Amino acid sequence: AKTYQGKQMFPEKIKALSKDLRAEHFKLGNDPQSYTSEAAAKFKEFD
Amino acid sequence: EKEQKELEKDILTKAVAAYEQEVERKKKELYLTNKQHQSSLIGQMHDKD
Amino acid sequence: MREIVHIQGGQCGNQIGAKFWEVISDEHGIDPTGTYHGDSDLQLERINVYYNEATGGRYVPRAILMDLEPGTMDSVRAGPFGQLFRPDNFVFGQTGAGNNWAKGHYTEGAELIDSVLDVVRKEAEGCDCLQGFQITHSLGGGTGSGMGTLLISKVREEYPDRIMETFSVVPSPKVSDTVVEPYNATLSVHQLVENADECMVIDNEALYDICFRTLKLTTPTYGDLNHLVSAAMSGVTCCLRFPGQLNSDLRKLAVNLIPFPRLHFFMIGFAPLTSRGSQQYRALTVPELTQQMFDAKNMMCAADPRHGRYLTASALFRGRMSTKEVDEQMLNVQNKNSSYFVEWIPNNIKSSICDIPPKGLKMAVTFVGNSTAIQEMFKRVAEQFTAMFRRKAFLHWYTGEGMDEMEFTEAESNMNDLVSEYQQYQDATA
Amino acid sequence: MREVISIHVGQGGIQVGNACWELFCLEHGIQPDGQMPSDGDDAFNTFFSETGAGKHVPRAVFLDLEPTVIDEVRTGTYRQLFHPEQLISGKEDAANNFARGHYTIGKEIVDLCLDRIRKLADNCTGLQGFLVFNSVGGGTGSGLGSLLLERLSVDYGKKSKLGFTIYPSPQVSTAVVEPYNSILSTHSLLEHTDVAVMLDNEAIYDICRRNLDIERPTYTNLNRLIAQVISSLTASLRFDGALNVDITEFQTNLVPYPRIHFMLSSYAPIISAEKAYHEQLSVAEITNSAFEPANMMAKCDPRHGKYMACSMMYRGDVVPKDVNASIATIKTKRTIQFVDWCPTGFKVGINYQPPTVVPGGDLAKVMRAVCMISNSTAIAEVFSRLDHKFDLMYAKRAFVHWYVGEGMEEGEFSEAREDLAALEKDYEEVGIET
Amino acid sequence: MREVISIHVGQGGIQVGNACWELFCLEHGIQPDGQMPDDAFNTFFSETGAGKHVPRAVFLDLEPTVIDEVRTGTYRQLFHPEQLISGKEDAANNFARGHYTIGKEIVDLCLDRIRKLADNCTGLQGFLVFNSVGGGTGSGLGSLLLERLSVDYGKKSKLGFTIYPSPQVSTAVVEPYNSILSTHSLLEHTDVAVMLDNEAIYDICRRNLDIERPTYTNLNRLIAQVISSLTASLRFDGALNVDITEFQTNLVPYPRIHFMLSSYAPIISAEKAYHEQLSVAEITNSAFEPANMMAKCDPRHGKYMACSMMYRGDVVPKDVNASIATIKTKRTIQFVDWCPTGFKVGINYQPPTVVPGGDLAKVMRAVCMISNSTAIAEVFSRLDHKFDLMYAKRAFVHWYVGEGMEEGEFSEAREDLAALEKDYEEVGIET
Amino acid sequence: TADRNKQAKVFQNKELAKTNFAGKSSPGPAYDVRDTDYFTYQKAPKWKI
Ligand SMILES: Nc1nc2c(ncn2[C@@H]2O[C@H](COP(=O)(O)OP(=O)(O)OP(=O)(O)O)[C@@H](O)[C@H]2O)c(=O)[nH]1
Ligand SMILES: Nc1nc2c(ncn2[C@@H]2O[C@H](COP(=O)(O)OP(=O)(O)OP(=O)(O)O)[C@@H](O)[C@H]2O)c(=O)[nH]1
Ligand SMILES: Nc1nc2c(ncn2[C@@H]2O[C@H](COP(=O)(O)OP(=O)(O)O)[C@@H](O)[C@H]2O)c(=O)[nH]1
Numbered sequence A: 001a002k003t004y005q006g007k008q009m010f011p012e013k014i015k016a017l018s019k020d021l022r023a024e025h026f027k028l029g030n031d032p033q034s035y036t037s038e039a040a041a042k043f044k045e046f047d
Numbered sequence B: 001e002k003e004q005k006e007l008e009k010d011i012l013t014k015a016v017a018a019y020e021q022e023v024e025r026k027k028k029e030l031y032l033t034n035k036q037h038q039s040s041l042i043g044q045m046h047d048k049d
Numbered sequence C: 001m002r003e004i005v006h007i008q009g010g011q012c013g014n015q016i017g018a019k020f021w022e023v024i025s026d027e028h029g030i031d032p033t034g035t036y037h038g039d040s041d042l043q044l045e046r047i048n049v050y051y052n053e054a055t056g057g058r059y060v061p062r063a064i065l066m067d068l069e070p071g072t073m074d075s076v077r078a079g080p081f082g083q084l085f086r087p088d089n090f091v092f093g094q095t096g097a098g099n100n101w102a103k104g105h106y107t108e109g110a111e112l113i114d115s116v117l118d119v120v121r122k123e124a125e126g127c128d129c130l131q132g133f134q135i136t137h138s139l140g141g142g143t144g145s146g147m148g149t150l151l152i153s154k155v156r157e158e159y160p161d162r163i164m165e166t167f168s169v170v171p172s173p174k175v176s177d178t179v180v181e182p183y184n185a186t187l188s189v190h191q192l193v194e195n196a197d198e199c200m201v202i203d204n205e206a207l208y209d210i211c212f213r214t215l216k217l218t219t220p221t222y223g224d225l226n227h228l229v230s231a232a233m234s235g236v237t238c239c240l241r242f243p244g245q246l247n248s249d250l251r252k253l254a255v256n257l258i259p260f261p262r263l264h265f266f267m268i269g270f271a272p273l274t275s276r277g278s279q280q281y282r283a284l285t286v287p288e289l290t291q292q293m294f295d296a297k298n299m300m301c302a303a304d305p306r307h308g309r310y311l312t313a314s315a316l317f318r319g320r321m322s323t324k325e326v327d328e329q330m331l332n333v334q335n336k337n338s339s340y341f342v343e344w345i346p347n348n349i350k351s352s353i354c355d356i357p358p359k360g361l362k363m364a365v366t367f368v369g370n371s372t373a374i375q376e377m378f379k380r381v382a383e384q385f386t387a388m389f390r391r392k393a394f395l396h397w398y399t400g401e402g403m404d405e406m407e408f409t410e411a412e413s414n415m416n417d418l419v420s421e422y423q424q425y426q427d428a429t430a
Numbered sequence D: 001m002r003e004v005i006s007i008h009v010g011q012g013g014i015q016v017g018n019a020c021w022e023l024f025c026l027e028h029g030i031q032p033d034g035q036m037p038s039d040g041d042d043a044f045n046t047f048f049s050e051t052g053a054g055k056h057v058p059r060a061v062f063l064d065l066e067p068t069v070i071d072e073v074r075t076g077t078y079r080q081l082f083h084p085e086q087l088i089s090g091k092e093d094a095a096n097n098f099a100r101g102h103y104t105i106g107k108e109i110v111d112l113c114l115d116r117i118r119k120l121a122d123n124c125t126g127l128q129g130f131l132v133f134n135s136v137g138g139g140t141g142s143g144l145g146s147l148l149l150e151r152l153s154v155d156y157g158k159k160s161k162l163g164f165t166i167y168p169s170p171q172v173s174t175a176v177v178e179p180y181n182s183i184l185s186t187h188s189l190l191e192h193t194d195v196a197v198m199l200d201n202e203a204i205y206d207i208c209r210r211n212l213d214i215e216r217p218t219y220t221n222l223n224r225l226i227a228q229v230i231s232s233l234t235a236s237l238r239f240d241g242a243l244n245v246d247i248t249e250f251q252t253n254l255v256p257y258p259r260i261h262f263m264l265s266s267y268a269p270i271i272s273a274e275k276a277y278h279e280q281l282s283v284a285e286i287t288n289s290a291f292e293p294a295n296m297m298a299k300c301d302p303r304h305g306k307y308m309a310c311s312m313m314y315r316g317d318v319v320p321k322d323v324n325a326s327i328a329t330i331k332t333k334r335t336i337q338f339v340d341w342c343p344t345g346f347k348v349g350i351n352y353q354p355p356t357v358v359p360g361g362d363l364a365k366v367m368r369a370v371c372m373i374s375n376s377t378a379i380a381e382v383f384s385r386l387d388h389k390f391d392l393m394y395a396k397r398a399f400v401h402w403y404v405g406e407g408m409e410e411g412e413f414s415e416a417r418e419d420l421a422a423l424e425k426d427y428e429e430v431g432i433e434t
Numbered sequence E: 001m002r003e004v005i006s007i008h009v010g011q012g013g014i015q016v017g018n019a020c021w022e023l024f025c026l027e028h029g030i031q032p033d034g035q036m037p038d039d040a041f042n043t044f045f046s047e048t049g050a051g052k053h054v055p056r057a058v059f060l061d062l063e064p065t066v067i068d069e070v071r072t073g074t075y076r077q078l079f080h081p082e083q084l085i086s087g088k089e090d091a092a093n094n095f096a097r098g099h100y101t102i103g104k105e106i107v108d109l110c111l112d113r114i115r116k117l118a119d120n121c122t123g124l125q126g127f128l129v130f131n132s133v134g135g136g137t138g139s140g141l142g143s144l145l146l147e148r149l150s151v152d153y154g155k156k157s158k159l160g161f162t163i164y165p166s167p168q169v170s171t172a173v174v175e176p177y178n179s180i181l182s183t184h185s186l187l188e189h190t191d192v193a194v195m196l197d198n199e200a201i202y203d204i205c206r207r208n209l210d211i212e213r214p215t216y217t218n219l220n221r222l223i224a225q226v227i228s229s230l231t232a233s234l235r236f237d238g239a240l241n242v243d244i245t246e247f248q249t250n251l252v253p254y255p256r257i258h259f260m261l262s263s264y265a266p267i268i269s270a271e272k273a274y275h276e277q278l279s280v281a282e283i284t285n286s287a288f289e290p291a292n293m294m295a296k297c298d299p300r301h302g303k304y305m306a307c308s309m310m311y312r313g314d315v316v317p318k319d320v321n322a323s324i325a326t327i328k329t330k331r332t333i334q335f336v337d338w339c340p341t342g343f344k345v346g347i348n349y350q351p352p353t354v355v356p357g358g359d360l361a362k363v364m365r366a367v368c369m370i371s372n373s374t375a376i377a378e379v380f381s382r383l384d385h386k387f388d389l390m391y392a393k394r395a396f397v398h399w400y401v402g403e404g405m406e407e408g409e410f411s412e413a414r415e416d417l418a419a420l421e422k423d424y425e426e427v428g429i430e431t
Numbered sequence F: 001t002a003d004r005n006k007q008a009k010v011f012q013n014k015e016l017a018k019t020n021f022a023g024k025s026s027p028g029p030a031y032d033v034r035d036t037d038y039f040t041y042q043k044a045p046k047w048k049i
């Protein structure tokens, strides 16, 4: 009876670790790349 | 033609969220049943005791 | 048109899938919430390649999920970008084979793959005209290796005209994950070669080789590895989705790299992979693309590509670039390693150009080719397998579940036939 | 979507089992009163039962033929927790007479134990296995389980099992008749249990004295340390993980042949809050301590042979990178040599949940932990000494007469020695290189 | 428009009926005084036009001690005053007395009372007869009452909750005689009846209800529970109702074999009930558990013909349909070869209300079973041994010869038991 | 190509309680627990003349 007593002291860390494990962590080059067709600027309407 | 197509996004998202309440309502509501029943017989235990 | 579907088996394919769709959505612009917010107009031109269409404008990726254990999928089905998959789509088992190739291929697989074949059938045939399949699964994993490999067996039996794809990882000798890797791996290769049209191998060791050497990243994480697979694996399909200079389907690269009906293993590499600090100092230029792209320290495979002579090399240059060429560099590069190109196949490199780059890189390229250097990987794995088999150690499992030793010897027979028949061309001369 | 059933027969299992369940109970936040406090789902299903609302029924069935130990808990703090009628108790003590526990008094007891097990199994959806803890060095403890194992194996079919037994110390002993009871249980258990670990008590005696700095520990302190190990091994099946390891995926990577299924495990790190704060406890140093000769939880010297296959479990916030570094570090080592027929003997497992510190106890809270379960050739040392202990006393048939008085055939002891000797012959054979 | 009439003879029947009536009145909502504080009481109760509710009952007995307790206890105002026909002398375990000498003069009054009760009702569906076999007066008027009822009415059914004596625990010495004799008379005139041997209940009570020293007051309460569970379908609505008419068209494979033994569960005292979920799947498993079988006849010694089980509570039928699957798959209990499948089910809605100050606690779920198993032959044969040992040299025979019973009358009774034994053996013999 | 039977082995959610909790039944009502009250209360004493 002496050894076992109440002393009862009662998940964001686990979620943070799970999200941490799935992060790419090296990002990429800061893209200045914007969409444009390779052969659309070559042919434009002429006056 | 797009107009009628876009007319449902409001309907379904609201509806599913509308149904989603039933998912949460029954679960919270059901717990009230046993608690009354589970708490009901403690008087029986004291009455039995 | 000429669209493809994705089926991932085992935990690896699932966890691997969780990132690819994360990358794919960003480029085409699918909102994880599934609606469209594209900035340009080209993004919706060929969006059918990897997607479908249903009511409300949402797009449902057609990624079949199949596993013999519940832990992995439910975990992925709740993280970020996890809402895209239709829960009605795909299923999974409740027991699991536990790294036992036999169990995942005969007992648990048989009772479960019947239902899965239904889901693949409905999805694939629905499209206008199926182009091929891409399957991701780690050979060394028991449940993934067994049930997944069997599905490929039945699949090719019903569409004798379609193509298929596989992205595989073989346990490098340095770092091992399951003491029972040899048995399932040796059994696995036998079934893959006979039917697998294209088999890509990426070695866990190299990925750790890549990160700690070039990126200079202090501490890596599984997250980094999946991207590296994600960056290149998506690369081989973009030209199938956007207009460009020279667009090539999944079949063309097949035509221009596989010499004979049996040798169908390639090694891939992605570039440029730069460290955080060296990004601004590094120069985006034509010479850097090709020079690094053939660098030994970049290929994601354990084999050193210099151990032999390349048979053929295929590249898919991406981004808006001039056209005098890297080809002249390719022409210049071809000779500069004269001893390293097998002579009896002149003009042993292909080129292709598409005009839509990945988010961030203004210029990038993906490498693919067949090289004799892969001979070492099977040799070392061959050495490992022979070790455990002479003594029949652990043999009770596979023998006690409906299999007999005769099959295991055959796996040794075919693999030796494959390897022994792979170096012959190396010494062949014209 | 999993479950498991816990069983204990005899005092040794009950005391640790009494000691163990505080660990499981404390982790999930279930207050001792059984009712959830104050007001992340399906995690508790791994070990507990839901009746609809409120308290939970631990998946345990305590058994014993002596009512002293059971009464203590049945009037203690944890009284309200366990099911009121699952604590079956006997009436007469076994008194270390093993023959008594298997044919005269044990017959009338197994009737309930089979029943109580059957009911609990019914409520399980995907039964994965069992945890059977019994003291081989005891009369009732060995006998009750041995009968229990014999029925169960013929009961369910091909189910997997795990046994965390407790063998008797080589030179320091509890009783005087234990050397006998050790061998007999072996035969009845050799051909029925898939996996059983070696945890002879003394090792913990030395371990506690060597690191924790305690000069006078009681049996309870031993009870806690064993409890953690169970937690470390089974932690994967209930929480999130980067690479899960299951109970059914245990003896698919630990038992080379159906015969040799006896392995020893060691635990680390163990350090108090009173000395830990002076070391970073980096993973580079932690793992190497695991293989140190003096930290083996089994009183044997692993250095005396080669290893068969080692499955080492971590837990905490360990990144997978370090595992590759550590494993590479181990192989290059010069003192530890691997058997010739096993190329790689590592199965890497990682779980996020860090061990929970029990206030007022010994273990403190740290952000790293690695637990290992390895089957190595060195275990032959324990078996050889047991036979030498056994053979002598039989020389003049001392104490053999009582075993005769309970209905045990005289030759019953004859069959026992051969199995060990038959097994004794087996152990060396697997050690010969090709 | 559906009702039922009860007939009782003997002290055991009197007490059991009293208990079942407290249960029934409390459940349906009738206060002890009989004055109520839609039309559901018609099934059992008769309207007075203005005032209380008149219970549907008629009692018989030859010993005034127990009945006189009724006419001075807490239920004085319940029953009709002239319907408690009580005689003067007691048979005292002399079965001959109760069937030829003292009961013959009383048979008249019971018939008149029965006819009067029948006249008022317009939708009678069956009868319930209670009696203890191992009693002098009990059995004696039991046989003659059944004979007269059959001969007067015809095909109208009859259900009887008889009680033969336990294999070892007994309260009389001549019970093997009157019990064996009762079998012959009742065989051709009782349609369906359930064994409720006394011995089992103590084990049933002692293990689960957690009472060291149960008394007959504890014993009786349960049987009332079985009657209520079986009957509640007739009086309240259900998703799949069961009518008393639909029992011995499904639980009597042939005109001979019609003995089915029943069990109840969960029977769990409230001190510990709330520590288990009482899951619908698990509640039904205890139904066929041998330990809870209310009759001391192991179901494991034989096959099963067909068990009709009527659920009661809030069971969602989807659950029930699954439950049968596990039991059928089980290889412990195997059904006879010629039987397709011997399950019929019924679902009720209301829970069992707990009698005040009782032991059994209320649970949201409850299922009661009524099964006829070939193994039931164990009880008939076992009583045969004692009867043979008795008649081997005719101890206690001399007191039945003078009472008016011919010497030969005992002989043919033995033959009937052997015929029943042979019939059980043959029917159990597979094709 | 999927027959109706064996098609329920697919796991949709935790609703398998009503159809899959019996997987390892531990056989069925076979074991005997009758008159096993010898362990909760003391036997009524039995003596000799
Ligand atoms: N490690 C450890 N072992 C214990 C402890 N208590 C008892 N034992 C072991 O248990 C053996 C004796 O058996 P018991 O624990 O008493 O229980 P049993 O195995 O059921 O047999 P009995 O002795 O008759 O009760 C001794 O040899 C001890 O080695 C303990 O607190 N810690
Ligand atoms: N179920 C139950 N049966 C009882 C009880 N008391 C007596 N019995 C049964 O009654 C039988 C003895 O006959 P009684 O019921 O006492 O008397 P009887 O039925 O009126 O017939 P006689 O004895 O001739 O007057 C015994 O064999 C018991 O089976 C009881 O409290 N509960
Ligand atoms: N890239 C990557 N590989 C992984 C990850 N987790 C496991 N692996 C690899 O997968 C192999 C184990 O496969 P496994 O999951 O057991 O296969 P399964 O049994 O079919 O699920 C190991 O050799 C690892 O190299 C991860 O998160 N990322």
Ligand SMILES: [Mg+2]
Binding pocket: D011, D066, D093, D094, D095, D096, D138, D140
């Ligand atoms: Mg003891």
Ligand SMILES: [Mg+2]
Binding pocket: E010, E011, E063, E135, E136, E137, E138
């Ligand atoms: Mg009487």
